[PDB]
Amino acid sequence: HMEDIKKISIFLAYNVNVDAIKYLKEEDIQKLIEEFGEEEIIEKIEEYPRKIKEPLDFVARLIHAIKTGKPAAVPLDNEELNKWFDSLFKYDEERMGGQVGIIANLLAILDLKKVIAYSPLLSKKQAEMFNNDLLYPIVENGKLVLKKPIEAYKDNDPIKINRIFEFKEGIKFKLGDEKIIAPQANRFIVASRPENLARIEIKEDLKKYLPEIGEMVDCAILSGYQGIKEKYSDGKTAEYYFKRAKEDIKLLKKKDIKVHLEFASIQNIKIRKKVVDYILPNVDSVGMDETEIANILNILGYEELSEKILKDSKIEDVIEGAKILLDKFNLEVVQVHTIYYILFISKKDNPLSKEELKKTLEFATILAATKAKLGDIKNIEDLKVGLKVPHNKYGELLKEIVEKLKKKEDYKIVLIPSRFVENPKSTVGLGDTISTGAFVSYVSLLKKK
Ligand SMILES: Nc1ncnc2c1ncn2[C@@H]1O[C@H](COP(=O)(O)O)[C@@H](O)[C@H]1O
């Protein structure tokens, strides 16, 4: 369990935010009903507002989402309503949000050699969420300077905050003559994609220093493409920002680094196709689940294979879909993870051995089990709790099937069962945790060679 991971430097971009979370109870929803009126809410629920313009909009959309138990996200109509919303519906706790912020703080906890995180906005309240060991790129006096986020914040900068409302399964309240029971625990999110506050991009002053960043770094993890809009009020489009994102990878890759992408669940099929066209063909590693790999194969035209994966979920079909992704997009490794297993596929000429790829995946299952059972990771010593979680029994059966499948190839295929937690404290961002552990451990073993 010796960690060669600490010898790795990494760059992260682009999405960082603050998560203000409210843990709802029956008493909280009852107070909203009395304050705003049972009859006005019912009338508003039939209206089904697309955006929240008055406090009654948030109340109606929240109750509507609890009734279905399905996730829902509704933005505020205007950014000038932020202070009014926060003073009206107070939070329980604030913490770091976003794929960059969460993973960077975790990598800083794991004593990585150098962790450079970048985000467009850096207010004082946001810069205090970062770990003190993190570094933020700044241009001053015509040179690239890495300084700590608390020493590089800006007072005039806006802040991006996601207001999250969690409700447990079976929360019961009465609205009118209807009795409402939550069929499933879920989250209702009040958040906005960046426009007129910031943009998903590396600013023009830092773009000339991306190759210099790629020299002092071993690998990069890029995320946040789901926040790009189709059109913008100033006249810019998604193509404008996806082209520049393609430029950032090319500038970073003028030096020898590995770039990793975690395939996020993007509802917009048009932005999802942009990530397949602009980002995926230009990175070196990709991680996803069974649902997203079927979405990718569907975009590539393998509709017959996409339907088999979503309907039956047999490992032999998922393996065949990952081999299509590997050969088409100049990738080095494809990683597929579920609740039962995590699959790893590389080409035959990969410098790592079969047993080394297993050790890479064994670290990913320990880091994931720790976060699922503990709910959060605050110290390196906490990994011993994830070690206590035994392997999935059904995944051991899948492992034997993969060994037998190799009866007659140019691929290194490794399967390992996942350390499943029966009663996890949380499940948000667990896919980013497994994928980061596998990629970071994979870059470690390549560095030894
Ligand atoms: N109770 C659990 N114990 C361990 N791992 C889990 C548990 N629930 C979910 N996971 C992992 O979380 C991943 C979710 O990633 P995603 O759906 O891509 O965000 C799954 O593929 C599982 O590997």
mmCIF file of N, CA, C and O in Angstrom, residues 32-100:
data_model
loop_
_atom_site.group_PDB
_atom_site.id
_atom_site.type_symbol
_atom_site.label_atom_id
_atom_site.label_comp_id
_atom_site.label_asym_id
_atom_site.label_seq_id
_atom_site.Cartn_x
_atom_site.Cartn_y
_atom_site.Cartn_z
ATOM 1 N N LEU A 32 -43.199 26.106 5.092
ATOM 2 C CA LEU A 32 -43.370 26.756 3.797
ATOM 3 C C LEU A 32 -44.832 26.761 3.369
ATOM 4 O O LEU A 32 -45.309 27.744 2.789
ATOM 5 N N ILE A 33 -45.554 25.672 3.643
ATOM 6 C CA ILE A 33 -46.958 25.581 3.247
ATOM 7 C C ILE A 33 -47.776 26.666 3.933
ATOM 8 O O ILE A 33 -48.575 27.364 3.298
ATOM 9 N N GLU A 34 -47.589 26.823 5.244
ATOM 10 C CA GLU A 34 -48.361 27.816 5.982
ATOM 11 C C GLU A 34 -47.978 29.232 5.571
ATOM 12 O O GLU A 34 -48.848 30.101 5.441
ATOM 13 N N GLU A 35 -46.687 29.481 5.345
ATOM 14 C CA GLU A 35 -46.232 30.843 5.078
ATOM 15 C C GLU A 35 -46.703 31.338 3.716
ATOM 16 O O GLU A 35 -47.062 32.512 3.570
ATOM 17 N N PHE A 36 -46.709 30.467 2.708
ATOM 18 C CA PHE A 36 -47.049 30.869 1.350
ATOM 19 C C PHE A 36 -48.450 30.449 0.923
ATOM 20 O O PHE A 36 -48.926 30.916 -0.117
ATOM 21 N N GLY A 37 -49.120 29.594 1.692
ATOM 22 C CA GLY A 37 -50.488 29.220 1.391
ATOM 23 C C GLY A 37 -50.610 27.930 0.608
ATOM 24 O O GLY A 37 -49.932 27.745 -0.405
ATOM 25 N N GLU A 38 -51.485 27.028 1.061
ATOM 26 C CA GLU A 38 -51.637 25.743 0.384
ATOM 27 C C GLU A 38 -52.266 25.915 -0.992
ATOM 28 O O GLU A 38 -51.917 25.197 -1.937
ATOM 29 N N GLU A 39 -53.187 26.870 -1.128
ATOM 30 C CA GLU A 39 -53.904 27.038 -2.387
ATOM 31 C C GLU A 39 -53.048 27.751 -3.429
ATOM 32 O O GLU A 39 -53.120 27.429 -4.620
ATOM 33 N N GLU A 40 -52.226 28.712 -3.000
ATOM 34 C CA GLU A 40 -51.346 29.400 -3.941
ATOM 35 C C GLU A 40 -50.261 28.473 -4.479
ATOM 36 O O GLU A 40 -49.849 28.613 -5.637
ATOM 37 N N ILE A 41 -49.788 27.531 -3.661
ATOM 38 C CA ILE A 41 -48.767 26.594 -4.123
ATOM 39 C C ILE A 41 -49.346 25.638 -5.157
ATOM 40 O O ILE A 41 -48.720 25.371 -6.191
ATOM 41 N N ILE A 42 -50.544 25.107 -4.898
ATOM 42 C CA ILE A 42 -51.180 24.191 -5.843
ATOM 43 C C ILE A 42 -51.387 24.871 -7.191
ATOM 44 O O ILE A 42 -51.125 24.281 -8.247
ATOM 45 N N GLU A 43 -51.858 26.119 -7.175
ATOM 46 C CA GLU A 43 -52.018 26.866 -8.419
ATOM 47 C C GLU A 43 -50.680 27.058 -9.120
ATOM 48 O O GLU A 43 -50.598 26.988 -10.352
ATOM 49 N N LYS A 44 -49.616 27.292 -8.348
ATOM 50 C CA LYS A 44 -48.300 27.507 -8.941
ATOM 51 C C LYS A 44 -47.709 26.212 -9.484
ATOM 52 O O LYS A 44 -47.001 26.235 -10.498
ATOM 53 N N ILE A 45 -47.982 25.081 -8.828
ATOM 54 C CA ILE A 45 -47.465 23.798 -9.302
ATOM 55 C C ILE A 45 -48.032 23.470 -10.677
ATOM 56 O O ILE A 45 -47.330 22.932 -11.543
ATOM 57 N N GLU A 46 -49.308 23.795 -10.908
ATOM 58 C CA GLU A 46 -49.880 23.603 -12.235
ATOM 59 C C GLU A 46 -49.211 24.507 -13.262
ATOM 60 O O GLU A 46 -49.084 24.131 -14.434
ATOM 61 N N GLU A 47 -48.766 25.694 -12.843
ATOM 62 C CA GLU A 47 -48.066 26.585 -13.761
ATOM 63 C C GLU A 47 -46.709 26.017 -14.156
ATOM 64 O O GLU A 47 -46.289 26.146 -15.312
ATOM 65 N N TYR A 48 -46.013 25.382 -13.207
ATOM 66 C CA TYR A 48 -44.713 24.756 -13.429
ATOM 67 C C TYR A 48 -43.720 25.767 -13.991
ATOM 68 O O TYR A 48 -43.387 25.711 -15.181
ATOM 69 N N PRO A 49 -43.237 26.708 -13.178
ATOM 70 C CA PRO A 49 -42.318 27.728 -13.698
ATOM 71 C C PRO A 49 -40.991 27.132 -14.140
ATOM 72 O O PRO A 49 -40.416 26.275 -13.465
ATOM 73 N N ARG A 50 -40.503 27.604 -15.289
ATOM 74 C CA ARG A 50 -39.207 27.146 -15.784
ATOM 75 C C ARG A 50 -38.067 27.785 -15.005
ATOM 76 O O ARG A 50 -37.026 27.155 -14.783
ATOM 77 N N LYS A 51 -38.246 29.032 -14.584
ATOM 78 C CA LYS A 51 -37.274 29.740 -13.770
ATOM 79 C C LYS A 51 -37.965 30.287 -12.528
ATOM 80 O O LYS A 51 -39.186 30.459 -12.495
ATOM 81 N N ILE A 52 -37.164 30.555 -11.504
ATOM 82 C CA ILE A 52 -37.658 31.041 -10.221
ATOM 83 C C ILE A 52 -37.555 32.560 -10.225
ATOM 84 O O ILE A 52 -36.456 33.120 -10.169
ATOM 85 N N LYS A 53 -38.705 33.229 -10.293
ATOM 86 C CA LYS A 53 -38.774 34.684 -10.268
ATOM 87 C C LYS A 53 -39.270 35.248 -8.947
ATOM 88 O O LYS A 53 -38.849 36.339 -8.561
ATOM 89 N N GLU A 54 -40.152 34.541 -8.258
ATOM 90 C CA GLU A 54 -40.666 34.922 -6.953
ATOM 91 C C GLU A 54 -40.485 33.752 -5.999
ATOM 92 O O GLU A 54 -40.307 32.611 -6.437
ATOM 93 N N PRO A 55 -40.503 34.004 -4.684
ATOM 94 C CA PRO A 55 -40.313 32.896 -3.731
ATOM 95 C C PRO A 55 -41.302 31.756 -3.910
ATOM 96 O O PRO A 55 -40.969 30.606 -3.600
ATOM 97 N N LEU A 56 -42.509 32.039 -4.405
ATOM 98 C CA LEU A 56 -43.491 30.986 -4.630
ATOM 99 C C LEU A 56 -43.058 30.018 -5.725
ATOM 100 O O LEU A 56 -43.500 28.863 -5.723
ATOM 101 N N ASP A 57 -42.204 30.458 -6.653
ATOM 102 C CA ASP A 57 -41.694 29.558 -7.682
ATOM 103 C C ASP A 57 -40.827 28.463 -7.075
ATOM 104 O O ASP A 57 -40.984 27.281 -7.403
ATOM 105 N N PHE A 58 -39.897 28.840 -6.194
ATOM 106 C CA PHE A 58 -39.043 27.846 -5.552
ATOM 107 C C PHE A 58 -39.865 26.858 -4.737
ATOM 108 O O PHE A 58 -39.573 25.656 -4.727
ATOM 109 N N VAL A 59 -40.897 27.346 -4.047
ATOM 110 C CA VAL A 59 -41.723 26.474 -3.218
ATOM 111 C C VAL A 59 -42.450 25.446 -4.078
ATOM 112 O O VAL A 59 -42.506 24.259 -3.737
ATOM 113 N N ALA A 60 -43.004 25.882 -5.212
ATOM 114 C CA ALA A 60 -43.761 24.967 -6.063
ATOM 115 C C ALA A 60 -42.854 23.927 -6.712
ATOM 116 O O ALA A 60 -43.190 22.738 -6.742
ATOM 117 N N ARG A 61 -41.703 24.354 -7.238
ATOM 118 C CA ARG A 61 -40.796 23.416 -7.892
ATOM 119 C C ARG A 61 -40.180 22.437 -6.900
ATOM 120 O O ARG A 61 -39.911 21.285 -7.257
ATOM 121 N N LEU A 62 -39.948 22.868 -5.658
ATOM 122 C CA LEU A 62 -39.404 21.960 -4.653
ATOM 123 C C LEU A 62 -40.407 20.865 -4.304
ATOM 124 O O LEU A 62 -40.058 19.680 -4.266
ATOM 125 N N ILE A 63 -41.659 21.245 -4.046
ATOM 126 C CA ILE A 63 -42.681 20.261 -3.696
ATOM 127 C C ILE A 63 -42.951 19.332 -4.872
ATOM 128 O O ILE A 63 -43.175 18.127 -4.693
ATOM 129 N N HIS A 64 -42.932 19.874 -6.091
ATOM 130 C CA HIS A 64 -43.139 19.047 -7.275
ATOM 131 C C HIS A 64 -42.054 17.985 -7.402
ATOM 132 O O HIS A 64 -42.340 16.831 -7.744
ATOM 133 N N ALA A 65 -40.801 18.352 -7.121
ATOM 134 C CA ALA A 65 -39.707 17.394 -7.251
ATOM 135 C C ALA A 65 -39.778 16.319 -6.174
ATOM 136 O O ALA A 65 -39.479 15.148 -6.439
ATOM 137 N N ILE A 66 -40.173 16.694 -4.954
ATOM 138 C CA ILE A 66 -40.284 15.720 -3.871
ATOM 139 C C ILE A 66 -41.358 14.686 -4.181
ATOM 140 O O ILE A 66 -41.234 13.514 -3.801
ATOM 141 N N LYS A 67 -42.417 15.091 -4.885
ATOM 142 C CA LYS A 67 -43.509 14.169 -5.179
ATOM 143 C C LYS A 67 -43.056 13.051 -6.111
ATOM 144 O O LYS A 67 -43.493 11.903 -5.968
ATOM 145 N N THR A 68 -42.174 13.361 -7.062
ATOM 146 C CA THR A 68 -41.704 12.367 -8.018
ATOM 147 C C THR A 68 -40.460 11.623 -7.551
ATOM 148 O O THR A 68 -40.171 10.543 -8.077
ATOM 149 N N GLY A 69 -39.720 12.170 -6.587
ATOM 150 C CA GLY A 69 -38.494 11.539 -6.141
ATOM 151 C C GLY A 69 -37.357 11.570 -7.136
ATOM 152 O O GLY A 69 -36.318 10.953 -6.885
ATOM 153 N N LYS A 70 -37.521 12.276 -8.266
ATOM 154 C CA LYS A 70 -36.556 12.410 -9.343
ATOM 155 C C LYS A 70 -35.783 13.717 -9.209
ATOM 156 O O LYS A 70 -36.311 14.707 -8.693
ATOM 157 N N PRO A 71 -34.532 13.762 -9.665
ATOM 158 C CA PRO A 71 -33.738 14.982 -9.498
ATOM 159 C C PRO A 71 -34.238 16.105 -10.393
ATOM 160 O O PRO A 71 -34.753 15.878 -11.490
ATOM 161 N N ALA A 72 -34.078 17.333 -9.904
ATOM 162 C CA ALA A 72 -34.527 18.511 -10.629
ATOM 163 C C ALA A 72 -33.621 19.684 -10.290
ATOM 164 O O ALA A 72 -33.164 19.815 -9.152
ATOM 165 N N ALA A 73 -33.368 20.535 -11.284
ATOM 166 C CA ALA A 73 -32.507 21.700 -11.114
ATOM 167 C C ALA A 73 -33.147 22.890 -11.811
ATOM 168 O O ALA A 73 -33.404 22.838 -13.018
ATOM 169 N N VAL A 74 -33.403 23.954 -11.054
ATOM 170 C CA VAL A 74 -34.068 25.146 -11.578
ATOM 171 C C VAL A 74 -33.217 26.372 -11.271
ATOM 172 O O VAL A 74 -32.843 26.591 -10.110
ATOM 173 N N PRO A 75 -32.891 27.195 -12.262
ATOM 174 C CA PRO A 75 -32.067 28.378 -12.002
ATOM 175 C C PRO A 75 -32.894 29.564 -11.528
ATOM 176 O O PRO A 75 -34.108 29.642 -11.732
ATOM 177 N N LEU A 76 -32.204 30.495 -10.876
ATOM 178 C CA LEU A 76 -32.804 31.784 -10.567
ATOM 179 C C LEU A 76 -32.917 32.616 -11.838
ATOM 180 O O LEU A 76 -32.057 32.549 -12.721
ATOM 181 N N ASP A 77 -33.993 33.402 -11.931
ATOM 182 C CA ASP A 77 -34.233 34.186 -13.138
ATOM 183 C C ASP A 77 -33.124 35.205 -13.366
ATOM 184 O O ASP A 77 -32.737 35.468 -14.510
ATOM 185 N N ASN A 78 -32.596 35.781 -12.289
ATOM 186 C CA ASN A 78 -31.583 36.820 -12.386
ATOM 187 C C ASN A 78 -30.615 36.680 -11.221
ATOM 188 O O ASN A 78 -30.999 36.281 -10.120
ATOM 189 N N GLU A 79 -29.349 37.021 -11.477
ATOM 190 C CA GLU A 79 -28.325 36.966 -10.442
ATOM 191 C C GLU A 79 -28.515 38.023 -9.361
ATOM 192 O O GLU A 79 -27.890 37.915 -8.300
ATOM 193 N N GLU A 80 -29.357 39.033 -9.595
ATOM 194 C CA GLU A 80 -29.649 40.025 -8.565
ATOM 195 C C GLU A 80 -30.571 39.491 -7.478
ATOM 196 O O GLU A 80 -30.797 40.189 -6.485
ATOM 197 N N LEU A 81 -31.108 38.285 -7.642
ATOM 198 C CA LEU A 81 -31.968 37.663 -6.646
ATOM 199 C C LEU A 81 -31.202 36.781 -5.669
ATOM 200 O O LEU A 81 -31.820 36.184 -4.782
ATOM 201 N N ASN A 82 -29.875 36.691 -5.806
ATOM 202 C CA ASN A 82 -29.097 35.766 -4.985
ATOM 203 C C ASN A 82 -29.167 36.132 -3.508
ATOM 204 O O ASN A 82 -29.458 35.281 -2.660
ATOM 205 N N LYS A 83 -28.889 37.397 -3.177
ATOM 206 C CA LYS A 83 -28.919 37.820 -1.780
ATOM 207 C C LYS A 83 -30.307 37.659 -1.175
ATOM 208 O O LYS A 83 -30.434 37.344 0.014
ATOM 209 N N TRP A 84 -31.354 37.867 -1.975
ATOM 210 C CA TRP A 84 -32.713 37.732 -1.464
ATOM 211 C C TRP A 84 -33.070 36.272 -1.220
ATOM 212 O O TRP A 84 -33.715 35.946 -0.216
ATOM 213 N N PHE A 85 -32.661 35.379 -2.124
ATOM 214 C CA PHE A 85 -32.929 33.959 -1.931
ATOM 215 C C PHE A 85 -32.197 33.422 -0.708
ATOM 216 O O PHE A 85 -32.770 32.665 0.084
ATOM 217 N N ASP A 86 -30.931 33.808 -0.535
ATOM 218 C CA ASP A 86 -30.138 33.280 0.569
ATOM 219 C C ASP A 86 -30.620 33.801 1.918
ATOM 220 O O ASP A 86 -30.544 33.079 2.919
ATOM 221 N N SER A 87 -31.115 35.040 1.972
ATOM 222 C CA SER A 87 -31.665 35.558 3.219
ATOM 223 C C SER A 87 -33.022 34.948 3.545
ATOM 224 O O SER A 87 -33.426 34.951 4.712
ATOM 225 N N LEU A 88 -33.722 34.418 2.544
ATOM 226 C CA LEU A 88 -35.065 33.888 2.731
ATOM 227 C C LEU A 88 -35.063 32.395 3.046
ATOM 228 O O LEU A 88 -35.828 31.945 3.905
ATOM 229 N N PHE A 89 -34.216 31.619 2.372
ATOM 230 C CA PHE A 89 -34.114 30.172 2.575
ATOM 231 C C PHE A 89 -32.688 29.858 3.020
ATOM 232 O O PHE A 89 -31.836 29.494 2.206
ATOM 233 N N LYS A 90 -32.437 29.989 4.321
ATOM 234 C CA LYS A 90 -31.085 29.849 4.845
ATOM 235 C C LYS A 90 -30.590 28.409 4.746
ATOM 236 O O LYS A 90 -31.360 27.450 4.836
ATOM 237 N N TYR A 91 -29.279 28.273 4.569
ATOM 238 C CA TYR A 91 -28.618 26.985 4.435
ATOM 239 C C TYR A 91 -28.253 26.417 5.805
ATOM 240 O O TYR A 91 -28.324 27.096 6.831
ATOM 241 N N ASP A 92 -27.854 25.146 5.811
ATOM 242 C CA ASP A 92 -27.346 24.489 7.009
ATOM 243 C C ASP A 92 -25.826 24.490 7.082
ATOM 244 O O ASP A 92 -25.265 24.640 8.172
ATOM 245 N N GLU A 93 -25.146 24.331 5.948
ATOM 246 C CA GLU A 93 -23.690 24.343 5.926
ATOM 247 C C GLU A 93 -23.212 24.653 4.514
ATOM 248 O O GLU A 93 -23.919 24.403 3.535
ATOM 249 N N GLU A 94 -22.002 25.204 4.430
ATOM 250 C CA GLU A 94 -21.346 25.522 3.170
ATOM 251 C C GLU A 94 -20.043 24.743 3.063
ATOM 252 O O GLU A 94 -19.344 24.546 4.063
ATOM 253 N N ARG A 95 -19.715 24.307 1.851
ATOM 254 C CA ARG A 95 -18.467 23.595 1.607
ATOM 255 C C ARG A 95 -18.107 23.741 0.133
ATOM 256 O O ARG A 95 -18.862 24.312 -0.661
ATOM 257 N N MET A 96 -16.940 23.214 -0.227
ATOM 258 C CA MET A 96 -16.446 23.322 -1.592
ATOM 259 C C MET A 96 -17.291 22.483 -2.544
ATOM 260 O O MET A 96 -17.647 21.340 -2.244
ATOM 261 N N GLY A 97 -17.617 23.064 -3.700
ATOM 262 C CA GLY A 97 -18.356 22.358 -4.719
ATOM 263 C C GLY A 97 -17.644 22.438 -6.056
ATOM 264 O O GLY A 97 -16.747 23.255 -6.263
ATOM 265 N N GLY A 98 -18.067 21.575 -6.962
ATOM 266 C CA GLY A 98 -17.459 21.508 -8.274
ATOM 267 C C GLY A 98 -16.442 20.387 -8.367
ATOM 268 O O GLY A 98 -15.835 19.971 -7.372
ATOM 269 N N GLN A 99 -16.243 19.889 -9.588
ATOM 270 C CA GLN A 99 -15.347 18.754 -9.786
ATOM 271 C C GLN A 99 -13.896 19.133 -9.516
ATOM 272 O O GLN A 99 -13.135 18.335 -8.958
ATOM 273 N N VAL A 100 -13.493 20.344 -9.901
ATOM 274 C CA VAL A 100 -12.122 20.778 -9.651
ATOM 275 C C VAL A 100 -11.896 20.991 -8.160
ATOM 276 O O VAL A 100 -10.930 20.477 -7.585
#
